[PDB]
Each structure stands twice: as structure tokens, then as C-alpha cells.
């Protein structure tokens, strides 16, 4: 086990998929996605099973598997 594909679901139901190592910090995925949407990374919250993905979280830590989904929500007002 090395790489898995994660599906990132955009706010408009578009998707971008990322191949990541099980030990890669998910900051890299968050930054890439935000860059590709042209929005500041801190305007977004990235959720796995409804829980907030921190910059330092890894797929291994969060228990992610092949084709698991990450949802992108706008940050909450004041968050």
C-alpha cells in the first residue's frame, strides 16, 4: 500500500481527483485544490466524513481508502 486516489467534490458538484501517498500531509491537497479554484485556502473547509481535515492530517491517520470522498465547503462566517 502506497498511493490512493481521493475524490474532492466541489461546491458545484464538480470533482478533482488526487493521487496521494498514505503519509502525505493533506495540506498539499488542500492547497492544490484551492489554487485550482482560484480562491484563498482559508475561505474553504475540507471535510472527510463530515470532519475537518487539518493541514497535518494524513490519509493513514484519517483511515482513508481508495476512492474515498473529500467534500469542500465554504468556510463558515467568522471561521
Amino acid at each position: 500500500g502506497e498511493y490512493i486516489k481521493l475524490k474532492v467534490i466541489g461546491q458545484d458538484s464538480s470533482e478533482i481527483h488526487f493521487k496521494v501517498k498514505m503519509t502525505t500531509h493533506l495540506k498539499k491537497l488542500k492547497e492544490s485544490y484551492a489554487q485550482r479554484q482560484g480562491v484563498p485556502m482559508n475561505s474553504l473547509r475540507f471535510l472527510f466524513e463530515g470532519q475537518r481535515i487539518a493541514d497535518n492530517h494524513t490519509p493513514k491517520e484519517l483511515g482513508m481508502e481508495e476512492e474515498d470522498v473529500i467534500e469542500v465547503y465554504q468556510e463558515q462566517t467568522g471561521g
Binding site: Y3, S14, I16, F18, K19, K21, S32
Partner: peptide, 11 residues
């Protein structure tokens, strides 16, 4: 309509 998008992230 959108094409498939797969990005490999460096470690």
C-alpha cells in the same frame, strides 16, 4: 461535460 481530472501530488 467536464473531463476527468486526476492530479498526482508529490511527497
Amino acid at each position: 461535460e467536464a473531463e476527468e481530472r486526476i492530479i498526482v501530488l508529490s511527497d
